Structures are given as structure tokens and as C-alpha cells.
């Protein structure tokens, strides 16, 4: 799939962008990038 | 791979997903099993098989 | 009713063990009487309600017939400028120019989403405009056209069997057809 | 508090759900998500982490 | 959702058997709310579909009659098709075909918004789709219009009393109304 | 099918109880699929009657139409008008009326786009609102329209003089135009 | 530059805010954002990461 | 989430039914060998591997 | 009966093949096991555990 930005027509003449507002349950796969990144540094310190 | 989730619209104009019916040679790596071989390594060396061999042959 | 079945809290297997799992049967038996008794009110009430909207249809059309056989015989020689100033909402005009006027106005104000870029900058006020940034390929899910298991003679026809417990959720959903030159085809293997 | 998927047009016969863009001040529940997130290791070590 | 069910025929009076018959208690609970669920939407459904025939034929019956009204009580001025050429915005036109056909092209270029996968089939090229895909919970913020701290006429009035020194972003904002028969609706308990 | 479970009657706990819980259970589960089946077929069955009800009211209001047409058509009629009949695609029409009244039928399900406030609450029922929440500053990547390098056009012109590494992608494209009045404006020091 | 919402007329009269579905690849700035994430655990003590 | 039979109308008027093609990732629930972990699992030993070695034992 | 292969073109216009996706009850003739009796034969015995048994045994 493609991914668009979404425009609109400004009191002038110019046509700008703005955002829509989304949810994080609205999000396609935030949770696995987020998991992904997840910062697994030390595994243990001294075992523990 | 290309995997796609094939859904059809529902008696209510929802819509929803379906698995079709395929057949065994139809799936492609799938390594099946003979439904035989399952039974012939079955047995092998088999773990308590061996303790009891070496208990008897102490014995 | 609510069902409201008995759990197992209890410690000992004992008279209060079978006392509530008789209760938790008997529970489910007036239960699925209930709903049994419900589709066929939901059955009864369909069949009442379409059979009231069938007579409103019959004498709806009984009257507006009447008046068209007292319009004929009636007046002659009419015009269309003067017909053609009532529009399809039944609200009368006082002049066709007014209707179209009146038209106009209110369609003018309508938006037009415009995908290409070159057609975003000669968009009105009341317009948007979204086009392309990247494409990203994922798993899509696909909703076949011309696939149904309800109605036969379709081009391809499925029946349904033993549906499987748990389900999940359609991701990237898209609209298409399959069969010849479509987006999606066919064609047998060897 | 939908969130419903937007569909758009192709050329030939289609119909496919496409995304907008959002920014990072737009997702409602974004910050408190990230805060949830716990490391999987030892999360701090005798009160101090990162650099330690 | 399909209901699955755990058998016993194995001889066990455990831990696992109870959590598994409570399980099974549950799930036969769930399927039963999802039941219920199910047949009030048939309601819904059947409603809504029964309505918007009855506004369909409401409608016609309307237009219908005031289109034989018009015919019967109109009558056509001397200059009505020469000067039912200039639009809104003074642009003449040498004939009213001409007009006609420049406002459709013009008009047909709109745009529409489809809210149901039944009517996503049957879309249009410069349309768009807003099938709905799943319902967050959230914490809703309302607009009611009636409410008012400055009429002083309201239904309902405000009035300040003192302040927080704090405030929080609004989340998932709806405009509706507060009374009867409304979709917020206030009731007394004393 | 009518459910009948096995209530408990005997306190052994062997085969048989097993064996009869076990047969409650999938009498369970087969009732379960029996009325979702139900469910379906009422669904099914309550779009086909809604369909034959739309089908008749689509059809009288076609009789009525059809006569009223041919008793003003062909009578009369301006040349100019029925000229004018036939819209811009020319696809031939009744009596201009019908022409008028179909096109109102089209048009009048687009759809508005609304940016105030005040006009959401003055909606229609397939309109979308896009309401400000707030502000974000970041940075901008303007596109000039009055800016090209093609030969000689736009008030601006672009030079060619080399290239670099490392790409990047826009990010908030502002479509405009510089000069005088325009947003982005040219001010000479030095 | 500008965050809107997105409201609808739902069924009734009400006009309730609804939420589109929008991709990780979408939004503008995730990776500074998750890269700011307060999660960080202990990436290293004594210069020594991993099983120390 | 419902297996279904899907048909085709044949040129005889009879709905012949297909079988689609697929791949063992895309189906759910597969849970499939590995080949040469299938290697050793069927190489392993004889059923009565774990006799002989008590037999040279007492030998 | 009859096998179809199942392909989608993009927006160039070049076939490629898609995989529908499916569950492991609609297939005919998997014969999966149970996904946990795999293991029970996977461990077996790798004809180390039985020759030092024996070994001990004899020792």
C-alpha cells in the first residue's frame, strides 16, 4: 500500500499540509517496531 | 512472501475472512509425514526402554 | 434473560458441587428457550413491519394515481418550463431560473478530493488534496468481488464447513475482482 | 473513538486502504506507551543506569 | 464467536479439571452476551433498513404531488427560458443546453464519502472510503450546544464558582445535546 | 433444535457421567452452530423481502412518471428546451424535468468538507469536519509555483550548478507562490 | 504545521471524532521520539555489557 | 476464520470443485519438521539399539 | 481435484504469485502430530546415553 499527506487549502491562496490526529491502537506495527527497539542492554549483573 | 487474508463480504455488509480447502500436494515445503514413519521412530532407542535394558541386564 | 451461570469457588466436591451445576444446566435450558422464543418474535415483527410498509405503497399509489387521472381530462396543454420548476424533493419554485439558482448555490459548495499534485494548487476553498509520499508493501487482505457463499451462480462459489475456534483481525484491507484480465487471475496448474 | 481505515480508488478496478501521514504530536496515547515500556535486562544498577 | 467447549472423558478430579470447566463456564457466558449482542443488532438493522424505505416512498409521495400541484396552478411567463440563462455569479449563456451542460460537468467532478463497504463496491474514481476497522474505549470529551454560561435562557445554566490552575487536552471531542430523547440524557433519583 | 441437557441424577462419578457431560457438552456446541445458522437466514431472509420492497416502490414511481410525461411531452414544447433535454454525455431524457430531477438526485448525495466549528454543528449526514486542536511548528519545504528552470518562465529563474551527496526527503510541503502579496515575499537589503 | 480532527455525523444527529489508521513508515518524527524513549535500562557497567 | 469449499461452475453446469495453491508458512497452526532435524530424528537408533550394548555388558 | 494457482498482477502489469491464506483443518492429508508428542520422540536416545549406560552397568 502508499501512503498520502493530506492538504488543504489555507485562507489565502496556499495549499498546506496539516496533520490528522491518530490513536497508538490505530497504529499498524508500533508495537513490534517499538518492541524491536526495545533497549536490551545488560542482560545481568553478576547473574542477577 | 505474497500472503494474503481472503475475506469475503458478509449477509450484512460486513465483511469477513475465510480459509479455503486445499490439499496436501497443493502447499508447497510443507515436508509431510508418511503417517507411517511416525510409528517406525516411535520407538528407536527409546529413553526408559534403556534404563530398564540396563537394570535387567544388571539384574 | 441474562445468563448468570455458577462458577466453582467451592473446595470439597460435595452437596452445593452438584446443587450448582444442576442450577448452571438448568440455567442454559430457560436461556435457550428465551432465545428461541426471541428469533421468532424478530421473525413475526419483520413480517408485520413489511406488511405495513407493502399496504402504505398500495395506497400511496391508489391517491397519487387518482391525482394524475383528475390532472388528465382535466387542464390541457401544459407546458415543461413551468413543470420542470418542481424539483425531485417536492419543493416548488417560483421561476425556473429560481430553481436552477437555488441548485446551483447549493450544489456549488460541494468538495472534490484531488489526488495528483498538479490538480491539488487549482482546487477551490472547500477542497483537499492528498498525494502519494511512499509506498510501504505489507500483507493486505482481500475482499473478492465476484467470491460468495450465500448467493450461487456467482463466479466462483464457496460452501461453508466446520468454522475453526479463535479469529483475527484483517489488516491493509482492498476492494477487487478475480477471473480473466482482472487484477487477481486464474489459470490451472499443468 | 473509531479508528477507521481509508479507502481510496485505483486506476483500474480497485479499491485499497491507504495511511496519512501523522506527526508525533498527533498520536494521543503515544507518550504514555513509550513510558510503559520497561527494559528487559537489569533496569538500573544500585539506583543509577544507562552509563553505568 | 465459535462456541468451544473442553470434554472430560479422561478420569481426573484435579486442578486442571476445575480450570478448565470454569473456563468452560466462561466461555459459554461469552457466547451468550455475544448472542445477545448479535440479535439486538438485528433490530438495529431491520430498522433502519424499514425507515429508510418509508422516508424513500415518503418522498416520492411528496414530490409527486407537488409536481401535479405545480401543473395544475402554473402557468409560463412571457420571458422565462431568455432569462433563465445567467447563473449565480452573472456568467450568461447563449442557451440554456450550453448552461445545463457546463453545470453537470462541472458538478460531476465532485466528490462523495462512502461510510459502508456496500457502497465502497459502487464507488466513484475522485471518492473516498472510511470503513471502520476497530472502537478504542477512551475517555470522551462532549460540546454540549445547550449548555450555555452566558444565555441565561438556557435549559440548562452555568455559573462560576473558582478555577484549578490546570487543564488537560481534550480527547476524542463529540458535539451533541443534554435532554430528553437525546443522545445525553439527564434523569432524578432524589 | 430444542436443547435438552442431562441434569445430574446419580452421584457415581463413573463412565456414564462422564460420558452424558461430555454428551451436554457437544448438545452445547451443536445448538450453538444451529443458532448461528438461525441468525444468518434472518438476516438473508430480511434483505430479500427489504429488496422486493424496494423493488415495487422503485417501480410505481415509474408508471406515474412515465404517464405524466407523456402527456406534456410532445405537445408544445420550445425547441430550445427540448434541445436542452439531452444532457452534456447525450444520453437522450424525458421532459427537461426529468433531466433536471435526476442530476438533483446525483448531485445532492456528494459531500461538503467543514473547517468551522460553527458549521459542523450545520452538517449533513455524509460530510466530514476537519477541526483544529492545535498548532506544531517544525519546519517547512515550500513549493514555489512561481519558480521553474524549464526555459525562461516564472518570475524567478533557476541556474544550474551541481549536486551533492546524501538526499533527503521533503516533509510539510507548503504549496505557494513568492513575490508581492503572496505569503512568501521578497524584501532587497543590501 | 497543523494537527486537526476528524469529526463525523454519527447516526442520530451527533458529530463524533473519529481516527484514521496510519503506518509506522508514515509518521514524521518516530524514530527521534522512541529514540527519546525514558526506557533505557543499563547498556553497560564498567565498560562491560551483557552477562558481567 | 471458517474453512470453506470453493467451486467453480464447469463448462458441463456442474460447480466442480479446486484446490487452491498455497505455501506451509501461510497456513496457521502448521507445525512442521525441519528436514535434517527429520534427518535425525529417523537416522536416531534400531528399536533394539539398547540391547546390544547390554549384551556386550554381560558379554 | 483440480489444482489453480493463484496470482495477482501489479501496477505494471507482470503476474506474480500470491498464496491464500488457510488453516490446518481444511487441508486434506497434513496428518500433523500434536506439535508436544514431536518431542517426546525428538530426544530419544542418541547412542550416547545407551553405550555409557551400558558402560556403568558393566562397571
Not at chain 2, 7 to 32: C, D, I, M, R, W
Not at chain 3, 121 to 140: H, V, Y
Request: contains cysteine.
Amino acid at each position: 500500500t502508499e501512503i498520502k499527506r493530506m492538504l488543504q487549502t489555507k485562507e489565502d491562496n496556499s495549499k498546506e499540509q496539516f496533520y490528522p490526529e491518530t490513536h497508538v491502537a490505530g497504529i499498524v506495527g508500533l508495537t513490534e517496531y517499538v518492541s524491536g527497539q526495545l533497549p536490551t542492554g545488560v542482560v545481568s549483573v553478576n547473574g542477577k | 512472501t505474497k500472503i494474503v487474508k481472503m475475506s469475503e463480504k458478509n449477509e450484512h455488509g460486513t465483511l469477513e475472512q475465510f480459509y479455503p480447502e486445499t490439499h496436501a500436494e497443493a502447499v508447497k515445503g510443507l515436508v509431510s509425514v508418511s503417517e507411517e514413519e511416525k510409528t517406525i521412530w516411535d520407538q528407536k532407542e527409546s529413553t526408559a526402554g534403556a534404563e530398564q535394558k540396563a537394570n535387567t541386564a544388571l539384574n | 434473560m441474562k445468563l448468570d451461570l455458577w462458577k466453582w469457588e467451592m473446595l470439597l466436591q460435595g452437596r452445593e458441587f452438584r446443587n450448582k451445576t444442576n442450577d448452571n444446566w438448568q440455567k442454559l435450558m430457560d436461556w435457550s428457550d428465551f432465545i428461541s422464543t426471541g428469533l421468532s418474535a424478530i421473525y413475526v415483527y419483520v413480517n408485520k413491519a413489511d406488511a405495513t410498509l407493502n399496504n402504505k405503497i398500495d395506497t400511496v399509489d391508489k391517491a397519487v394515481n387518482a391525482r394524475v387521472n383528475e390532472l388528465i381530462s382535466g387542464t390541457e396543454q401544459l407546458s415543461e418550463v413551468v413543470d420542470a420548476r418542481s424539483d425531485a424533493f417536492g419543493a416548488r419554485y417560483p421561476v425556473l431560473r429560481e430553481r436552477l439558482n437555488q441548485e446551483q448555490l447549493n450544489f456549488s459548495k460541494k468538495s472534490t478530493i484531488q489526488f495528483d499534485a498538479s490538480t491539488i494548487i487549482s482546487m477551490e476553498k472547500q477542497d483537499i488534496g492528498l498525494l502519494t509520499s511512499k509506498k510501504i508493501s505489507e500483507a493486505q487482505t482481500v475482499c473478492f468481488l465476484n467470491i460468495s457463499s450465500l448467493d450461487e451462480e456467482a463466479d466462483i462459489v464457496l460452501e461453508k464447513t466446520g468454522e475453526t475456534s479463535f479469529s483475527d483481525n484483517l489488516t491493509s484491507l482492498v476492494f477487487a475482482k478475480i477471473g480473466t484480465n482482472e487484477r487477481y487471475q486464474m489459470e490451472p496448474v499443468g | 473513538t473509531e479508528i477507521k481505515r481509508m479507502l481510496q480508488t485505483k486506476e483500474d478496478n480497485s479499491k485499497e486502504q491507504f495511511y496519512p501521514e501523522t506527526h508525533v504530536a498527533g498520536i494521543v496515547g503515544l507518550t504514555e506507551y513509550v513510558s510503559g515500556q520497561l527494559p528487559t535486562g537489569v533496569v538500573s544498577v544500585n539506583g543509577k543506569a544507562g552509563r553505568v
